[PDB]
Amino acid sequence: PTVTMMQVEEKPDVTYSDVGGCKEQIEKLREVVETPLLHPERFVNLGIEPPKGVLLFGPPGTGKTLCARAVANRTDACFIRVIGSELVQKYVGEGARMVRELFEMARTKKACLIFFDEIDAIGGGDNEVQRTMLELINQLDGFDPRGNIKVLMATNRPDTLDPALMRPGRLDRKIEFSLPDLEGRTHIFKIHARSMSVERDIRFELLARLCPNSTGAEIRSVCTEAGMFAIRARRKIATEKDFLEAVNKVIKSYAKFS
Amino acid sequence: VDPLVYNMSHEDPGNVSYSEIGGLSKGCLLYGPPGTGKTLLARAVASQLDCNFLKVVSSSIVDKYIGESARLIREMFNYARDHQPCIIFMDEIDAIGGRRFSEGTSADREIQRTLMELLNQMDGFDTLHRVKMIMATNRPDTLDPALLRPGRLDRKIHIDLPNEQARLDILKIHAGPITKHGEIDYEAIVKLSDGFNGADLRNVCTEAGMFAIRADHDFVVQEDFMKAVRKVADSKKLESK
Amino acid sequence: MDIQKQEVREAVELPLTHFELYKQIGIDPPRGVLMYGPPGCGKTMLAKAVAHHTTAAFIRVVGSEFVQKYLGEGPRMVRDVFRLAKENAPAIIFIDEIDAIATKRFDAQTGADREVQRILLELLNQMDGFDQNVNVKVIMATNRADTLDPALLRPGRLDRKIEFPLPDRRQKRLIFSTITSKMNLSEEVDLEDYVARPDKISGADINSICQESGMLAVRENRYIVLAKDFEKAYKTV
Amino acid sequence: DPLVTVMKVEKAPQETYADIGGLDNQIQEIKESVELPLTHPEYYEEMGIKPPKGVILYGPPGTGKTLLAKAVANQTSATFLRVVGSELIQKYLGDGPKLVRELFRVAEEHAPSIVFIDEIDAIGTGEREIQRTMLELLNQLDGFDSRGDVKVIMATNRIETLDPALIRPGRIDRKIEFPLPDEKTKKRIFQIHTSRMTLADDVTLDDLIMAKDDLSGADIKAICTEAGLMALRERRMKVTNEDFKKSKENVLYKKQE
Amino acid sequence: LMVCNLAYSGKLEELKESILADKSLATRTDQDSRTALHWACSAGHTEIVEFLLQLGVPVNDKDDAGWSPLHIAASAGRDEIVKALLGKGAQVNAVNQNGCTPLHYAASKNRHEIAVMLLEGGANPDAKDHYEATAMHRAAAKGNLKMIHILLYYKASTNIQDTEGNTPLHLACDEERVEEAKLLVSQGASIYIENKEEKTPLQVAKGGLGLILKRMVEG
Amino acid sequence: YDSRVKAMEVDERPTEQYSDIGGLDKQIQELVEAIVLPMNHKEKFENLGIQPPKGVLMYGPPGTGKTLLARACAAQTKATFLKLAGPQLVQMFIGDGAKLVRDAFALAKEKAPSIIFIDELDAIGTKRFKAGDREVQRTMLELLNQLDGFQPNTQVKVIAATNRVDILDPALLRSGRLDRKIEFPMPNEEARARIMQIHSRKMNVSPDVNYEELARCTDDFNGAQCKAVCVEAGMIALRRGATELTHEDYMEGILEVQ
C-alpha cells in the first residue's frame, strides 16, 4: 500500500532540551531510550537484559513532543514512528501485511526501534479491527522480530481494555506526562532560540513566568500565532513588547471558554 | 432445512449396548440426580435401531432473532407427523425448563412461549399416539410443574442403581476388558457403593486402574479397587452437592 | 355501509353473470374498479367474499409479479393470462399496488420500469381494442394516488373510484364477531372500548391480532380470552 | 477527462487587492499570510519557520464572489489552482483519493501556485466512503512527506458542517471572521459593481441597500449585466432609475423564490 | 387450577366437597390472579357465588390488571350476580385497568336492571375513564337508546368531552343515529363545542342532518 | 481455508517445563500421569480396557498461572500446542461458533495428535434462564454434543481451565466432559516462595534470604503476581547498580506493582 511507504519518517525534530519538568520520569524513560543503545553489554552482563520501555498516556496536553524528543535523541540514526489512525480505512486487511513488512524491515534495519502512536484509533462491529489489533498483540508479545528493542503506546483514554490486559506480558513502566514546570517553559524557549528571530532583549524566563498553564504545545501555538503577528508587523526582528498582546490574547482569549 | 441433514445423516453403530444397560427390566421423564447414563440408554436403543436418527438438541431453540420458533416447532413436529415412524429425544431440558416464577424477560418469555406451543400440541387440539418424546433431565426441581402433569409422563424412570443385581450387572459389563488377580470379590464393591452414577462408577473403577497402574504392575488386585473406589467415591460424595 | 358492496355488487357481479348484454343494457365501460386508503387493510376479505359469492376462476397477481430480470416475460405472462381468461372463463384479475408500476419517469437509469410501463401502455391499448366481448374483469386497488399516471385516471378506463374510511366500525364489529363466533363466548368480553380505541389507534389485520391474542390465551391457565390479551395484544403489535 | 479542465483557470484577471475596500485588514491578513512565501522572502526564509499550510477562510455570502474576491489578490501575478464544489467526488464511483493525488502531482509540478478549495460540502451533502476519503483528503493535505511546496487556502460556507477533527491538522496558521453585509458592505459592493458603469442622478441608494436582505454579489452583478444590456437596448450606456428598479425586481423575486 | 374447572364447568357437589374438604381452595388463585369468584361470575353460576359469598370471600379482590368482579357481573348480564355482589357491598366505582367503571360494561350489554341497581347504590353517572369518556359515548357508539335514557333518569350529563374533544352528540351523529341525536339535542346537548379537529356536530353529520340538528336547537 | 481460525495459535512446543514450580506435586502428579500415560502406554490400554478422560477442569482463583503451568505440562506432552481464548467465540456474524468448534475438531480430528488448551471458559459459561450467553449456550452445548454424542472421540483430549467456579454449569459432568475436578487453591507463602525460588533460580539471588520477610509480605497473593515481582526485580535490579539481587527488592516490587 502507498500508506506504508508514505508513513516513512526521517526528519530532525525536537531534541532532549524539551524535558517537561518531570525530574524522575525523564530518567525513568531516559535510562531506557538512551542507555540501552549506548551500553549494550553493560545491561547484558550487569543484568539479564536491558529494560523494555515506558508508557506515556493520559491527558494529551503537550503530547507528541517527547516522541520527537525520542526521534532526535538517538545519536546514531532517527527511528521510524507509526501512527494508529491509518488502519481505519476501506477494504480491511492491510494491517497484517503492514505490520509484518514493517517488522520485517525492522529485521532488515539491524534491530531498529519502532514507535506505535495512537493506539486508541485501533483499540477499545469491531472484529475486523480485532484481527489487526489482536494480531498486533501476537506481533508484540511474539519475540520473532524482537522482544527487547522498545515498547511504548500513546492513548487519550484508558478505555482500551484488551491492550491493558495484554500489556503486562511485555509492556511495563506506565508513567504520566501532564504539564511542565516553571523552569521548563524557559527550556522550550531555549529550543525556540532557533525559531523566528528573537531579539536578545527578550528574556525567556520573563515570558515563561508571565503565562501559567503554558504547556509546550500551547506555547508552540504562542510562537505560531505570535510568529504570524510578527510577520504581519513588517519588522526585521521580534520584540516581546510587540507580540505580548498576541501572547496574553492567545492564552487568555482562548482560556476564557477553555 | 439444515438440521435435517444432521438428523438424517449420522448413524451410530453398536447392537450390544441394548443389552449392556444393566439390570433394567407419550412422554418419558429421565431424572438421574444419583445416576448418569441417560445417554448410554437413549443412545443404546438409538444406536440399536431407532428407526431414524431424529435427535433434537436443546440448543436448537435459541432463535437469536425475533422469537418465531413456532415455524420450527410446527416444521419439525410437522415432519414428525408426516413421516410415520419417528422417535424424538429431548436431552438437557433443564436449560429450557424455566419455572417462570417471577416476571420473565424477553429471552425467557419466548422459550416459555415455545412451552405454550408444547402445551398446545400435547394437551391441545392434536394427538400424539404414534410419536414418542424422551424428556431427559438431571434435577426434579425445575421440571416445569405445569408440564409435570401425569397426562404426558405416565411413569417416572429414575436412572439409579437400587437393586444389587443392577449394580452388579453394570459392574460386570463395565469390567469386561479389565484383568484382575485370582482373588475376586464383587460384594464389597457393589455393597459399599450406595446411590452412585453409572458411567462415573466406570470412571471411578478406571480411575482405580490408573491409580494401580502407577506401580506399572500388569496384574491389578481388588485392594486398590476397594480403597480407591472407596476414597474416590467419597470424593464424589464430597463433590455431589 | 353497503355502498362498496352494492357498487361492486351491481357494477361487477351483475355484468359478470350476463353474457353479451354489454351492448344491450346501455353500453358503458365500467370495467375498471379502483380502491384507495392506506390505513384500511382491505384487499383480502373483499377478495375472499368475491371468491365465495361467485364460483369461477380468479387471477390473483400482486403488482410486483413481473419484477424480474427478464423484461420480455411480462407480455408473455399477462398475454397467456389474457388468452386463458378470454378462452376458459370470465375470470377476475386483481391488480394490486399500481403505485410502483404507475409512476412517470424521464431518465434511462430505471429503463426496466419504463419498459414495463410501456408494456402497461401496450395492454392499456389492448384493453381499448378488447372493448367488444371480452371475457375477463379487471379490478384494481392502490394505496397512493399522488404519483399515479394520468392515463389510468382517464375516464372510460377507471370509471369506479371507491374509498376507505378511517373508522372501520362495522369492519371491527364484523371482524370481532367472525372470530368470537368460533371461539368461546365470554360474557365479560366487551367491544365498546375495543371499537372506540381502534378509532383512535387504527391498524390492519385485526383478525390476526385476535389470533395472536388467542396465542397468548392458549396458556391453559385462562380458559377464555379476555381484555388482558386484547389490550396486551394491542400494545405488543 | 473533461472535468479536469473546468477545475482551475489559467487567466490573469485584473482584479487586484486595491479594487475593494472596507476589509483592508481582512485582505492584508491573507495577503500577508500567503504572499510572504516565495515572494518577498527576507521576512519568511530568514526567520526559519515555514508553515506551508495557509489560512482557511469562509464567506457567508459565498457563491465565489467574496471567496474569489479574497483569493483574487493572489491571482495578479502568479499561477492559480482552483477547486470548486465537492460534486466531483460524488458524481462518480468511489475511485478514492486518486484525484487528490492528481492535484498533488500537478501542484508538485506547479509549486509556485495557490491551492483554493471552494464549496466544501463533502459531508454536508456511499456516505460512509465520503468520511474516509475526506479524512484521507486531510491526510494527504497535511503534507507528511513533502516540504514547503504550495499554500493551501480552503474556503467553505458553514463552519458547523466541518467536523472538529478537520480543524487541528488543516487549520494551523490562522482563521478570522467576516462581518455581516447588511447596509455598508452591500453599499461598497454596489459601488464597486457600479464604478465602471454610468448611472443617472435620480438613482437613489437607500432603497437599493434597503430592499436587499442577505444577498451575495452574483445577483447584483447579474442585474448589472442585464441592466447594462437592457439599458443598452436603446443604444445608451446610462442606466436610469426605473430600469434599475425593473432589474431590481429580479433581486426581490429571486431570493424570495 | 382444579377449582377453575370446578367453578367453570359448574360441578356442584365436587366444588362443595372440595371446599368443605379444603377451605384453602377458596382463597387460592391461578397464575393470572383470578380466584374462583372470577370464574363463577364469568360463568354466571348462582349457587357457587352464593356459597363463596356466603362464606365471606372479599368482594374487592382485583386481578393483576384491576378487574373487579363487579365488572364481570355488570358485563355478564346476570341480574342475580349483581344482586349478590351489590348485596355484599361491592365498590360501585371500582377502578379497572383502563380506569373504567362497571357502568360502561353494564351499558355494553344493554342491561337495564344492572344499571338501575348500580346507579341506585350510588354510582357516579358521569364517571370518566382514562380517555375522559363516559358510558354515553359507548352506548351511543352501539345504539343503546334506552340505556342512555335510563342514564338520563339519574340526571347524567350529555356534554362529556372525550380525549379528542368529542361530545356524546359527536359520537351519536357519527354513528348515524337520528333519533338519538334528536333526543340528546332535545335533552340539552351542545352543538357549539368543537373537537381537536375543529369540526362542529353539524359538519360531522352527513346528508344535511346539521340543518335539522340546529333546526331542533332553535325549535 | 479461513486461516483466521485454523491458524489461531501455531506453537510447536514451549520452553518452560513442569520443574519450574514447587510444592504442587501432590495435585499436579495426577495431571502429569494423565498426560504421560495416555501418550506412551496405548498398548496397555487394550489389556486393561482403559479410556483416558477427554475433559479436565483446571479451575482455581485467577492469577495462579494455570495457563503457563498447563503449557509447562504441554512441553512434556511433546505434541503440538494450540491455544484458544474464551471471548473468541463471540463474533459479529451468525453461526461463527460452529465454524470455530468444528474447525478446532477439524484440526484435532484430521491433523496429527496435538494438544489444545483453552482458558477463560468461565467468562462465557453463564447459564442464563435475547442474550449473548444463550448463543454461547448454543455453541457451548454444541461442543458438549460433540463430546457426548461422539463415541469416536477417543482422540486428542480437550483441556479447559476456568478462573472462577461461581457459575458452575451442571451439564459439565460426564466421562468425556470436564470430569477431572482437581481444586487448585491459592498457594501459601511457602508455595509462593518455592515457585518464586525456582522461577528466580537464574538471577544472582543473595544467599542470605531467610524467606521470613517475603513470606510475611506475601499475604493472599497468587502465582503470576509473585512472577511479576520476580520479573520486576529483574527489571529494577539492573538499574540498581549491584548485579546481585538484594533483599529489599521483594517488598519494593510488591509495593511497586501492588
Curated annotation (Swiss-Prot), chain A:
Similarity comment: Belongs to the AAA ATPase family.
Gene Ontology CC entries for this record: cytoplasm; cytoplasmic ribonucleoprotein granule; cytosol; extracellular region; ficolin-1-rich granule lumen; membrane; nucleoplasm; nucleus
Organism: Homo sapiens
Post-translation changes: Monoubiquitinated by RNF181.
Gene that encodes it: PSMC2
Job description of the protein: Component of the 26S proteasome, a multiprotein complex involved in the ATP-dependent degradation of ubiquitinated proteins. This complex plays a key role in the maintenance of protein homeostasis by removing misfolded or damaged proteins, which could impair cellular functions, and by removing proteins whose functions are no longer required. Therefore, the proteasome participates in numerous cellular processes, including cell cycle progression, apoptosis, or DNA damage repair.
Binding site for ATP: G58, P59, P60, G61, T62, G63, K64, T65
One of the GO biological process terms: positive regulation of proteasomal protein catabolic process
Superkingdom of origin: Eukaryota
This protein's UniProt keywords: Acetylation, ATP-binding, Cytoplasm, Nucleotide-binding, Phosphoprotein, Proteasome, Ubl conjugation
Annotated protein name in UniProt: 26S proteasome regulatory subunit 7
Induction comment from the UniProt entry of this chain: Expression is not cell cycle-dependent and occurs throughout the cell cycle.
Compartment annotation: Cytoplasm
Modified residues (N6-acetyllysine): K256
A GO molecular-function descriptor: ATP binding
Main location group: cytoplasm
Swiss-Prot record, chain B:
GO MF terms held by the record: ATP binding; ATP hydrolysis activity; identical protein binding; proteasome-activating activity; protein-macromolecule adaptor activity
Chief localization: cytoplasm
Subcellular location: Cytoplasm; Nucleus
Assembly and binders: Component of the 19S proteasome regulatory particle complex. The 26S proteasome consists of a 20S core particle (CP) and two 19S regulatory subunits (RP). The regulatory particle is made of a lid composed of 9 subunits, a base containing 6 ATPases including PSMC6 and few additional components. Interacts with PAAF1.
Source organism of this protein record: Homo sapiens (Human)
In-chain residues carrying the UniProt-annotated modification Phosphoserine: S102
One GO term of the biological process aspect: positive regulation of inclusion body assembly
Function: Component of the 26S proteasome, a multiprotein complex involved in the ATP-dependent degradation of ubiquitinated proteins. This complex plays a key role in the maintenance of protein homeostasis by removing misfolded or damaged proteins, which could impair cellular functions, and by removing proteins whose functions are no longer required. Therefore, the proteasome participates in numerous cellular processes, including cell cycle progression, apoptosis, or DNA damage repair.
Residues that hold ATP according to the record: G32, P33, P34, G35, T36, G37, K38, T39
Top-level taxonomic group: Eukaryota
The name this protein goes by in its record: 26S proteasome regulatory subunit 10B
Family under the similarity heading: Belongs to the AAA ATPase family.
Signal peptide span: none
N6-acetyllysine: residues carrying this PTM: K64
Whole-protein residues included: 115 to 383 of 389
From Swiss-Prot, chain C:
GO molecular function: ATP binding; ATP hydrolysis activity; proteasome-activating activity
Source organism superkingdom: Eukaryota
Keyword check for Transcription: no
Positions where N6-acetyllysine occurs in the chain: K228, K232
One GO cellular component, as annotated: cytosol
Signal peptide location: none
GO biological process: blastocyst development; proteasome-mediated ubiquitin-dependent protein catabolic process; proteolysis
Localization: Cytoplasm; Nucleus
Functional description taken from the UniProt entry: Component of the 26S proteasome, a multiprotein complex involved in the ATP-dependent degradation of ubiquitinated proteins. This complex plays a key role in the maintenance of protein homeostasis by removing misfolded or damaged proteins, which could impair cellular functions, and by removing proteins whose functions are no longer required. Therefore, the proteasome participates in numerous cellular processes, including cell cycle progression, apoptosis, or DNA damage repair.
Record's keyword terms, sorted: Acetylation, ATP-binding, Cytoplasm, Nucleotide-binding, Nucleus, Phosphoprotein, Proteasome
Name of the protein described by the UniProt record: 26S proteasome regulatory subunit 6B
Assembly and interaction partners: Component of the 19S proteasome regulatory particle complex. The 26S proteasome consists of a 20S core particle (CP) and two 19S regulatory subunits (RP). The regulatory particle is made of a lid composed of 9 subunits, a base containing 6 ATPases including PSMC4 and few additional components. Interacts with NR1I3. Interacts with PAAF1. Interacts with TRIM5. Interacts with ZFAND1.
Ligand binding (ATP): G37, P38, P39, G40, C41, G42, K43, T44
UniProtKB/Swiss-Prot annotation, chain F:
GO biological process, alphabetically ordered: blastocyst development; modulation by host of viral transcription; positive regulation of proteasomal protein catabolic process; positive regulation of transcription by RNA polymerase II; proteasome-mediated ubiquitin-dependent protein catabolic process
Molecular-function GO terms, alphabetical: ATP binding; ATP hydrolysis activity; identical protein binding; proteasome-activating activity
Post-translational modification: Sumoylated by UBE2I in response to MEKK1-mediated stimuli.
Main subcellular localisation: cytoplasm
Residues modified as Phosphoserine: S206
GO CC terms in record: cytosol; extracellular region; ficolin-1-rich granule lumen; membrane; nucleoplasm; nucleus; P-body; proteasome accessory complex
Superkingdom: Eukaryota
Keyword Cytoplasm set for record: yes
Binding-site list for ATP: G60, P61, P62, G63, T64, G65, K66, T67
Localization (cell): Cytoplasm; Nucleus
UniProtKB keywords: Acetylation, ATP-binding, Cataract, Cytoplasm, Deafness, Host-virus interaction, Intellectual disability, Neuropathy, Nucleotide-binding, Nucleus, Phosphoprotein, Proteasome, Ubl conjugation
Entry keyword S-adenosyl-L-methionine: no
Subunit comment: Component of the 19S proteasome regulatory particle complex. The 26S proteasome consists of a 20S core particle (CP) and two 19S regulatory subunits (RP). The regulatory particle is made of a lid composed of 9 subunits, a base containing 6 ATPases including PSMC3 and few additional components. Interacts with PAAF1.
Family of this protein: Belongs to the AAA ATPase family.
The name this protein goes by in its record: 26S proteasome regulatory subunit 6A
UniProt organism field: Homo sapiens (Human)
Span of the entire protein shown here: 168 to 428 of 439
